[PDB]
Amino acid sequence: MNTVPFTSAPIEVTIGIDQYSFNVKENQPFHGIKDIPIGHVHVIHFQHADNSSMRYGYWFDCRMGNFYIQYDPKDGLYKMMEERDGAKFENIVHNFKERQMMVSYPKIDEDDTWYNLTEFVQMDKIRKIVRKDENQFSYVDSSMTTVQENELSDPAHSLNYTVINFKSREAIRPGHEMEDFLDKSYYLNTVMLQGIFKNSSNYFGELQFAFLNAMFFGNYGSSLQWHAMIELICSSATVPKHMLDKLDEILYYQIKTLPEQYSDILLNERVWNICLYSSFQKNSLHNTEKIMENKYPELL
Amino acid sequence: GAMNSSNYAELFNNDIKLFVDDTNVYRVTVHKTFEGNVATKAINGCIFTLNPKTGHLFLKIIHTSVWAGQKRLSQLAKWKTAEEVSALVRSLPKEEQPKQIIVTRKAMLDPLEVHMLDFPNIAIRPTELRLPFSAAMSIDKLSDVVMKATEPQMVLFNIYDDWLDRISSYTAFSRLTLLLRALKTNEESAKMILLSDPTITIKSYHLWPSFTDEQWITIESQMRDLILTEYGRKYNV
Ligand SMILES: Cc1ccc(O)c(NS(=O)(=O)N(C)C(C)C)c1
């Protein structure tokens, strides 16, 4: 079990840790989050009470270093930093635990939600989508745009998701125009899986990361990316059976976790109705179709 | 953007463009089988690809053999149309290639876009207009070359005959659309108008009769009457 210490909480803020969140009042004696499960990436995220504009946060993995939060009054945000002096850090954390000034990561024992949402998400891949190589952790916020959004403007602050475009030369073999457009298996299996992602685990990891950025930060380009990766599988007639079964589980837990009151903006009617009812894989997502029909029958 | 009433004059500027109409590509007769089921029999079709500024018509004849052994023919027809249009563009010298292609039906947008990926600077555009190009097979010489074809074939026509010697391309296209609208609404009447005065012949190298300027005004008036009439005979007005 690991810990992220906060030097202080000078401004009122809602703090999220994975799917949990709590309200911290201005200058409340809050000094961080303990008992964070080892083995998973995590995200710690922020929404200021004064300006609900800009949700922002940090993806990290406690195995990769000792990280803490300290408010910067010049840039106006809670920043993650790495403490390189391990002895200093353990000492800080031990004092704050003794004074019981930390919240406990509030995981229920039966609950696999976070595992299920981050099963394929690796810090190393996150850091290639979010390029900032001097830090071990990655900053994301509501306004960051994707490389594909920038093609259609600050590259250093971009989300370098794998570009997917169904009407592109990469997606369409010369002389297979109709075939490849109506059945995207070539693009999925040869171009993306064999060529770019190398395996389905890295594909699912990027799909899961995109969803989580859409959900936690309202990041619109991430939502586009999530739906694009779903649609590419669903519009392929030929998908490995293990991938279809895993996709059904992935989407099931994503739909289960989505705040009910955000479905209108975070779910694309066309993609889901197409995937569940028209695509080649209309019959292959039983768990996802059942939860969607019981939780969001209006969208469909 | 889409082509409509408001930007109609763009058709006659000096940017090369083509209309593509796919409504006669896949043509069938529907009939009963010996068992009393229903079946289709394909007949020859054509892609109607027209430069509205010059009147040049690239009539790609679609022979029924292209459908042999294929499924989902109405869907295939759109992709076949896009393949042939793409092939046509590639066959033209660079300085003759169009800057825009306007499809008369929106279902042609994605097939043509995918086939034209090599031509990113050619704009593929829909239209809000309800254009009458389906009636092209009511022009006897076009119908005849399509039905007689024994193999895939491209035939080049000028659908304006020699009109551009005396009128503008705006006026030519407007005349063409009026003739085709008439032929589409009431083919027999429209055709009676065009040929009953027998002294006005169709030159061997033309599609329409050799009307004088004055005779064209009379003809155009008769076609407008026809179209309003049939609009009454249909709506009872
Ligand atoms: C919370 C935390 C973690 C790592 C750090 O390095 C610091 N620096 S400090 O805030 O300067 N500090 C040592 C304590 C008085 C708290 C604080």
Side-chain angles (χ1 to χ4, degrees), chain A residues 1-151 154-300, chain B:
Chain A
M1 305 308 263
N2 266 136
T3 305
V4 175
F6 278 50
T7 301
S8 62
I11 67 160
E12 195 154 307
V13 62
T14 305
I15 303 177
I17 176 63
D18 297 350
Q19 75 269 33
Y20 307 110
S21 67
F22 47 93
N23 306 305
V24 175
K25 296 295 171 295
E26 181 193 310
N27 276 315
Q28 176 193 314
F30 173 90
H31 292 276
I33 306 165
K34 61 174 205 168
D35 303 330
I36 302 165
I38 301 164
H40 307 126
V41 307
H42 296 283
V43 60
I44 183 169
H45 45 107
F46 298 94
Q47 185 150 234
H48 298 180
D50 56 19
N51 176 66
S52 55
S53 308
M54 194 187 53
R55 284 176 270 168
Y56 63 98
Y58 304 90
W59 291 94
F60 65 97
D61 183 336
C62 280
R63 296 176 285 194
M64 298 175 60
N66 297 309
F67 307 112
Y68 69 108
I69 299 290
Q70 192 164 78
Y71 184 70
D72 175 12
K74 177 161 159 90
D75 288 342
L77 80 174
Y78 289 98
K79 297 185 169 173
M80 179 163 284
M81 300 191 278
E82 184 167 357
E83 177 46 70
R84 77 161 285 115
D85 188 355
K88 181 174 179 186
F89 187 85
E90 300 171 3
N91 174 235
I92 288 299
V93 174
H94 174 274
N95 175 81
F96 280 162
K97 280 194 190 174
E98 274 289 280
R99 306 224 289 154
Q100 293 189 46
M101 289 296 117
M102 304 200 177
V103 290
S104 174
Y105 187 96
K107 183 177 169 307
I108 304 322
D109 305 273
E110 156 187 274
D111 176 54
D112 271 347
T113 295
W114 191 244
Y115 174 75
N116 287 342
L117 291 172
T118 60
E119 179 173 1
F120 299 102
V121 182
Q122 325 177 268
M123 260 319 306
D124 66 79
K125 299 307 205 303
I126 291 180
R127 298 186 68 240
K128 299 169 195 307
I129 294 164
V130 189
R131 314 192 160 289
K132 194 164 204 264
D133 296 7
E134 62 275 12
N135 300 327
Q136 290 286 280
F137 48 79
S138 301
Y139 169 97
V140 181
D141 69 26
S142 299
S143 71
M144 283 165 58
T145 53
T146 68
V147 165
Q148 170 176 72
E149 282 183 306
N150 299 327
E151 300 166 350
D154 191 6
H157 214 55
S158 286
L159 295 169
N160 302 271
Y161 293 120
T162 296
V163 174
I164 301 173
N165 176 358
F166 296 139
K167 292 188 284 182
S168 76
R169 172 54 64 219
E170 300 70 28
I172 302 290
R173 289 177 296 181
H176 300 256
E177 283 76 13
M178 181 185 198
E179 175 183 12
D180 282 356
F181 187 71
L182 294 182
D183 173 7
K184 317 207 175 277
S185 296
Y186 147 76
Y187 191 30
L188 172 66
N189 290 304
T190 296
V191 182
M192 290 281 169
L193 283 177
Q194 178 172 287
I196 300 192
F197 289 96
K198 307 306 181 183
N199 52 65
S200 55
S201 296
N202 295 331
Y203 188 99
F204 287 146
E206 185 169 321
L207 180 162
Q208 288 183 314
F209 184 56
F211 169 78
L212 291 168
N213 286 325
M215 183 175 57
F216 288 124
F217 304 110
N219 185 272
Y220 179 84
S222 296
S223 182
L224 291 180
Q225 184 68 11
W226 177 55
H227 287 92
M229 302 191 64
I230 298 172
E231 189 173 355
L232 176 57
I233 295 175
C234 291
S235 308
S236 292
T238 307
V239 185
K241 312 89 168 56
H242 74 272
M243 263 192 73
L244 293 167
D245 290 332
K246 187 67 62 161
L247 180 60
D248 192 31
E249 291 305 307
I250 287 167
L251 299 178
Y252 173 80
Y253 285 102
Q254 287 169 341
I255 296 305
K256 180 172 175 63
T257 301
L258 252 185
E260 301 69 44
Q261 301 289 310
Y262 286 39
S263 36
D264 34 303
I265 46 180
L266 288 169
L267 295 171
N268 185 280
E269 184 184 69
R270 177 193 70 81
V271 167
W272 283 100
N273 277 271
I274 269 58
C275 294
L276 299 180
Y277 303 121
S278 319
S279 79
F280 291 99
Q281 304 308 338
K282 63 190 175 302
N283 292 324
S284 306
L285 305 177
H286 299 124
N287 297 351
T288 293
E289 183 175 291
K290 193 170 290 303
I291 194 178
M292 285 282 295
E293 292 182 350
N294 277 280
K295 186 178 184 192
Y296 300 117
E298 328 84 39
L299 193 80
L300 326 162
Chain B
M3 188 279 280
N4 62 32
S5 270
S6 298
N7 54 26
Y8 187 76
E10 190 179 359
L11 298 177
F12 317 110
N13 73 14
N14 286 78
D15 288 3
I16 302 167
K17 45 184 72 64
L18 298 171
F19 279 114
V20 171
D21 181 82
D22 70 314
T23 63
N24 288 305
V25 163
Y26 174 48
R27 297 205 284 165
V28 297
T29 52
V30 179
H31 58 87
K32 281 281 193 63
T33 71
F34 181 87
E35 294 74 31
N37 310 119
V38 175
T40 57
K41 183 191 153 299
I43 58 159
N44 290 345
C46 55
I47 306 164
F48 182 96
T49 298
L50 168 67
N51 186 323
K53 180 91 174 193
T54 60
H56 288 203
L57 167 62
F58 305 86
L59 190 75
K60 177 66 191 223
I61 302 183
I62 304 297
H63 188 261
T64 56
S65 65
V66 306
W67 310 126
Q70 312 293 334
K71 276 88 175 75
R72 292 191 51 82
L73 295 183
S74 63
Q75 171 186 262
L76 176 61
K78 296 175 203 315
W79 290 87
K80 174 59 165 186
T81 294
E83 183 187 343
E84 291 297 341
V85 168
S86 172
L88 170 62
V89 169
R90 295 166 202 280
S91 85
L92 294 166
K94 181 167 189 256
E95 72 277 6
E96 298 178 39
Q97 293 173 339
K99 296 114 192 177
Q100 299 171 11
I101 299 168
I102 308 158
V103 300
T104 60
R105 311 199 291 174
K106 313 200 191 64
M108 279 303 308
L109 291 167
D110 278 353
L112 196 54
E113 170 168 359
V114 167
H115 268 284
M116 302 288 290
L117 290 176
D118 298 322
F119 294 94
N121 303 331
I122 301 184
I124 307 309
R125 301 179 62 207
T127 181
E128 295 172 21
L129 306 184
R130 37 280 199 172
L131 284 165
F133 293 150
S134 74
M137 292 294 101
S138 295
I139 304 170
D140 295 319
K141 293 185 179 190
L142 303 191
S143 181
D144 280 348
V145 70
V146 170
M147 290 315 290
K148 292 193 213 297
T150 61
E151 43 189 294
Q153 179 182 3
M154 168 82 86
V155 189
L156 307 184
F157 298 87
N158 188 323
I159 201 157
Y160 297 156
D161 289 352
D162 60 354
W163 303 342
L164 293 177
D165 296 350
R166 303 189 59 77
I167 64 174
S168 72
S169 66
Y170 179 109
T171 299
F173 189 83
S174 300
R175 181 182 292 163
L176 173 71
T177 63
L178 169 71
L179 291 167
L180 291 176
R181 183 60 72 199
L183 286 161
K184 176 166 190 160
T185 314
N186 188 330
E187 190 177 8
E188 196 218 318
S189 303
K191 287 196 182 190
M192 289 181 61
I193 296 173
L194 288 167
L195 308 144
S196 67
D197 178 326
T199 37
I200 301 148
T201 53
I202 303 176
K203 295 303 145 295
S204 56
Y205 48 85
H206 280 173
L207 299 176
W208 313 96
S210 303
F211 295 116
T212 55
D213 289 15
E214 295 313 279
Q215 287 172 337
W216 269 123
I217 298 290
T218 302
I219 291 284
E220 295 167 339
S221 153
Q222 278 158 27
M223 297 296 188
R224 297 193 186 96
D225 289 336
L226 187 156
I227 294 162
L228 158 67
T229 298
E230 278 304 323
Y231 175 105
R233 291 174 80 257
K234 189 224 262 198
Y235 290 103
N236 298 316
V237 160

PDB file of all heavy atoms in Angstrom, chain A residues 5-7 68 70 83 88 92 96, ligand 1:
ATOM      1  N   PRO A   5       1.376  12.127  -0.312  1.00  0.00           N
ATOM      2  CA  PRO A   5       1.414  13.322   0.843  1.00  0.00           C
ATOM      3  C   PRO A   5       1.094  14.552  -0.026  1.00  0.00           C
ATOM      4  O   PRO A   5       1.413  14.599  -1.200  1.00  0.00           O
ATOM      5  CB  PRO A   5       2.730  13.128   1.574  1.00  0.00           C
ATOM      6  CG  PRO A   5       3.626  12.556   0.566  1.00  0.00           C
ATOM      7  CD  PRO A   5       2.790  11.786  -0.435  1.00  0.00           C
ATOM      8  N   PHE A   6       0.403  15.497   0.576  1.00  0.00           N
ATOM      9  CA  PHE A   6       0.060  16.813   0.000  1.00  0.00           C
ATOM     10  C   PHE A   6       0.763  17.780   0.938  1.00  0.00           C
ATOM     11  O   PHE A   6       0.610  17.587   2.143  1.00  0.00           O
ATOM     12  CB  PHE A   6      -1.427  17.145   0.006  1.00  0.00           C
ATOM     13  CG  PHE A   6      -2.256  16.574  -1.107  1.00  0.00           C
ATOM     14  CD1 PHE A   6      -2.203  15.235  -1.434  1.00  0.00           C
ATOM     15  CD2 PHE A   6      -3.128  17.388  -1.808  1.00  0.00           C
ATOM     16  CE1 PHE A   6      -2.998  14.716  -2.440  1.00  0.00           C
ATOM     17  CE2 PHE A   6      -3.921  16.864  -2.816  1.00  0.00           C
ATOM     18  CZ  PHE A   6      -3.865  15.527  -3.120  1.00  0.00           C
ATOM     19  N   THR A   7       1.531  18.737   0.449  1.00  0.00           N
ATOM     20  CA  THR A   7       2.172  19.636   1.423  1.00  0.00           C
ATOM     21  C   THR A   7       1.018  20.387   2.118  1.00  0.00           C
ATOM     22  O   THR A   7       1.072  20.460   3.281  1.00  0.00           O
ATOM     23  CB  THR A   7       3.285  20.544   0.858  1.00  0.00           C
ATOM     24  OG1 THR A   7       4.359  19.831   0.256  1.00  0.00           O
ATOM     25  CG2 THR A   7       3.871  21.474   1.896  1.00  0.00           C
ATOM     26  N   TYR A  68       4.296  13.361  -4.578  1.00  0.00           N
ATOM     27  CA  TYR A  68       3.504  14.165  -3.640  1.00  0.00           C
ATOM     28  C   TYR A  68       2.906  15.339  -4.408  1.00  0.00           C
ATOM     29  O   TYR A  68       3.308  15.644  -5.518  1.00  0.00           O
ATOM     30  CB  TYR A  68       4.365  14.619  -2.471  1.00  0.00           C
ATOM     31  CG  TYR A  68       5.425  15.619  -2.813  1.00  0.00           C
ATOM     32  CD1 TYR A  68       5.286  16.928  -2.417  1.00  0.00           C
ATOM     33  CD2 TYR A  68       6.579  15.245  -3.475  1.00  0.00           C
ATOM     34  CE1 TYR A  68       6.273  17.853  -2.668  1.00  0.00           C
ATOM     35  CE2 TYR A  68       7.581  16.161  -3.741  1.00  0.00           C
ATOM     36  CZ  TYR A  68       7.414  17.474  -3.346  1.00  0.00           C
ATOM     37  OH  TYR A  68       8.337  18.428  -3.624  1.00  0.00           O
ATOM     38  N   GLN A  70       1.843  19.481  -4.238  1.00  0.00           N
ATOM     39  CA  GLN A  70       2.005  20.766  -3.559  1.00  0.00           C
ATOM     40  C   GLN A  70       1.364  21.831  -4.436  1.00  0.00           C
ATOM     41  O   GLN A  70       1.734  21.884  -5.620  1.00  0.00           O
ATOM     42  CB  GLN A  70       3.425  21.246  -3.560  1.00  0.00           C
ATOM     43  CG  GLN A  70       3.743  22.406  -2.655  1.00  0.00           C
ATOM     44  CD  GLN A  70       5.237  22.400  -2.554  1.00  0.00           C
ATOM     45  OE1 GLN A  70       5.897  22.856  -3.481  1.00  0.00           O
ATOM     46  NE2 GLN A  70       5.761  21.725  -1.546  1.00  0.00           N
ATOM     47  N   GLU A  83       9.697  13.188  -5.056  1.00  0.00           N
ATOM     48  CA  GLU A  83      10.636  13.397  -3.932  1.00  0.00           C
ATOM     49  C   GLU A  83      11.713  12.331  -4.150  1.00  0.00           C
ATOM     50  O   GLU A  83      11.332  11.180  -4.095  1.00  0.00           O
ATOM     51  CB  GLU A  83       9.938  13.221  -2.583  1.00  0.00           C
ATOM     52  CG  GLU A  83      10.880  13.352  -1.401  1.00  0.00           C
ATOM     53  CD  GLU A  83      11.812  14.543  -1.492  1.00  0.00           C
ATOM     54  OE1 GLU A  83      11.341  15.647  -1.371  1.00  0.00           O
ATOM     55  OE2 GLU A  83      12.973  14.344  -1.772  1.00  0.00           O
ATOM     56  N   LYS A  88      13.622  11.034   3.453  1.00  0.00           N
ATOM     57  CA  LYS A  88      12.841  12.237   3.790  1.00  0.00           C
ATOM     58  C   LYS A  88      11.356  11.928   3.621  1.00  0.00           C
ATOM     59  O   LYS A  88      10.577  12.190   4.529  1.00  0.00           O
ATOM     60  CB  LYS A  88      13.300  13.321   2.832  1.00  0.00           C
ATOM     61  CG  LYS A  88      12.681  14.685   2.979  1.00  0.00           C
ATOM     62  CD  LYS A  88      13.408  15.533   2.029  1.00  0.00           C
ATOM     63  CE  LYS A  88      12.979  16.968   1.957  1.00  0.00           C
ATOM     64  NZ  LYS A  88      13.734  17.572   0.844  1.00  0.00           N
ATOM     65  N   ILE A  92       8.232  11.973   6.161  1.00  0.00           N
ATOM     66  CA  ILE A  92       7.081  12.890   5.973  1.00  0.00           C
ATOM     67  C   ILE A  92       5.815  12.059   6.103  1.00  0.00           C
ATOM     68  O   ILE A  92       4.977  12.390   6.948  1.00  0.00           O
ATOM     69  CB  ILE A  92       7.152  13.599   4.613  1.00  0.00           C
ATOM     70  CG1 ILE A  92       8.264  14.646   4.578  1.00  0.00           C
ATOM     71  CG2 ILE A  92       5.795  14.187   4.242  1.00  0.00           C
ATOM     72  CD1 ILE A  92       8.080  15.726   5.594  1.00  0.00           C
ATOM     73  N   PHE A  96       2.648  12.238   8.890  1.00  0.00           N
ATOM     74  CA  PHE A  96       1.278  12.628   8.525  1.00  0.00           C
ATOM     75  C   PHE A  96       0.324  11.491   8.884  1.00  0.00           C
ATOM     76  O   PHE A  96      -0.773  11.775   9.324  1.00  0.00           O
ATOM     77  CB  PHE A  96       1.306  12.983   7.061  1.00  0.00           C
ATOM     78  CG  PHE A  96       1.803  14.315   6.597  1.00  0.00           C
ATOM     79  CD1 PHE A  96       2.177  14.479   5.270  1.00  0.00           C
ATOM     80  CD2 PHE A  96       1.931  15.382   7.458  1.00  0.00           C
ATOM     81  CE1 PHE A  96       2.634  15.693   4.803  1.00  0.00           C
ATOM     82  CE2 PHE A  96       2.358  16.595   6.968  1.00  0.00           C
ATOM     83  CZ  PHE A  96       2.728  16.746   5.658  1.00  0.00           C
TER      84      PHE A  96
HETATM   85  C1  LIG C   1       4.418  16.471   1.533  1.00  0.00           C
HETATM   86  C2  LIG C   1       5.790  16.515   1.141  1.00  0.00           C
HETATM   87  C3  LIG C   1       6.290  15.454   0.468  1.00  0.00           C
HETATM   88  C4  LIG C   1       7.504  15.573  -0.102  1.00  0.00           C
HETATM   89  C5  LIG C   1       8.190  16.773   0.062  1.00  0.00           C
HETATM   90  O1  LIG C   1       9.412  16.914  -0.354  1.00  0.00           O
HETATM   91  C6  LIG C   1       7.703  17.879   0.795  1.00  0.00           C
HETATM   92  N1  LIG C   1       8.422  19.010   0.998  1.00  0.00           N
HETATM   93  S1  LIG C   1       8.149  19.978   2.186  1.00  0.00           S
HETATM   94  O2  LIG C   1       6.880  20.384   2.139  1.00  0.00           O
HETATM   95  O3  LIG C   1       9.171  20.823   2.024  1.00  0.00           O
HETATM   96  N2  LIG C   1       8.379  19.128   3.505  1.00  0.00           N
HETATM   97  C7  LIG C   1       9.612  18.435   3.562  1.00  0.00           C
HETATM   98  C8  LIG C   1       7.502  18.955   4.707  1.00  0.00           C
HETATM   99  C9  LIG C   1       7.573  20.033   5.773  1.00  0.00           C
HETATM  100  C10 LIG C   1       6.053  18.592   4.523  1.00  0.00           C
HETATM  101  C11 LIG C   1       6.481  17.704   1.347  1.00  0.00           C
END
